[PDB]
């Protein structure tokens, strides 16, 4: 009834918050005239330079 589904909803709700956050943290914007170098803590800096835009 109300109890089970809503409880799951509760889990969903917090999960959604978390998920939204991760996606948010996932996106980055580089302004025009700027270029981003990506460095991984594991690998170090990668050779590919990223241009303007959201990535």
Curated annotation (Swiss-Prot):
Tissue-specific expression: Widely expressed in different tissues.
UniProt modified residues of type N-acetylalanine: 2
Keywords: Acetylation, Cell membrane, Coiled coil, Cytoplasm, DNA synthesis, Host-virus interaction, Membrane, Mitochondrion, Mitochondrion inner membrane, Nucleus, Phosphoprotein, Proto-oncogene
Cellular-component GO terms for this entry: cell surface; cytoplasm; early endosome; extracellular exosome; membrane; mitochondrial inner membrane; mitochondrial prohibitin complex; mitochondrion
Compartments where located: Mitochondrion inner membrane; Nucleus; Cytoplasm; Cell membrane
Gene Ontology molecular-function annotations: complement component C3a binding; complement component C3b binding; enzyme binding; histone deacetylase binding; protein heterodimerization activity; proteinase activated receptor binding; transcription corepressor activity
Induction: Expression increases approximately 3-fold upon entry into G1 phase compared with other phases of the cell cycle. Also induced following inhibition of mitochondrial protein synthesis by thiamphenicol.
GO terms for biological process, alphabetical: antiviral innate immune response; B cell activation; cellular response to interleukin-6; DNA biosynthetic process; epigenetic regulation of gene expression; mitochondrion organization; modulation by host of viral RNA genome replication; negative regulation of androgen receptor signaling pathway
Keyword field contains S-adenosyl-L-methionine: no
Main localization (coarse): mitochondrion
Subunit structure: The mitochondrial prohibitin complex consists of two subunits (PHB1 and PHB2), assembled into a membrane-associated ring-shaped supercomplex of approximately 1 mDa. Interacts with STOML2. Interacts with MAP1LC3B (membrane-bound form LC3-II); the interaction requires PHB2 and takes place upon Parkin-mediated mitochondrial damage. Interacts with STAT3 (unphosphorylated or phosphorylated at 'Ser-727'). Interacts with CLPB. Interacts with CD86 (via cytoplasmic domain); the interactions increases after priming with CD40. (Microbial infection) Interacts with SARS coronavirus/SARS-CoV nsp2 protein.
Function as written in the Swiss-Prot or TrEMBL entry: Protein with pleiotropic attributes mediated in a cell-compartment- and tissue-specific manner, which include the plasma membrane-associated cell signaling functions, mitochondrial chaperone, and transcriptional co-regulator of transcription factors in the nucleus. Plays a role in adipose tissue and glucose homeostasis in a sex-specific manner. Contributes to pulmonary vascular remodeling by accelerating proliferation of pulmonary arterial smooth muscle cells. In the mitochondria, together with PHB2, forms large ring complexes (prohibitin complexes) in the inner mitochondrial membrane (IMM) and functions as a chaperone protein that stabilizes mitochondrial respiratory enzymes and maintains mitochondrial integrity in the IMM, which is required for mitochondrial morphogenesis, neuronal survival, and normal lifespan. The prohibitin complex, with DNAJC19, regulates cardiolipin remodeling and the protein turnover of OMA1 in a cardiolipin-binding manner. Regulates mitochondrial respiration activity playing a role in cellular aging.
UniProt family annotation: Belongs to the prohibitin family.
Protein name: Prohibitin 1
Lineage start: Eukaryota, Metazoa, Chordata, Craniata, Vertebrata
From-to range in the entire protein, with total length: 1 to 55 of 272
């Amino acid at each position: 009834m109300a109890a089970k589904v809503f409880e799951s909803i509760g889990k969903f709700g917090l999960a959604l918050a978390v998920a939204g956050g991760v996606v948010n943290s996932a996106l980055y914007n580089v302004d025009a005239g700027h270029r981003a170098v990506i460095f991984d803590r594991f690998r170090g800096v990668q050779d590919i330079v990223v241009g303007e835009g959201t990535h």
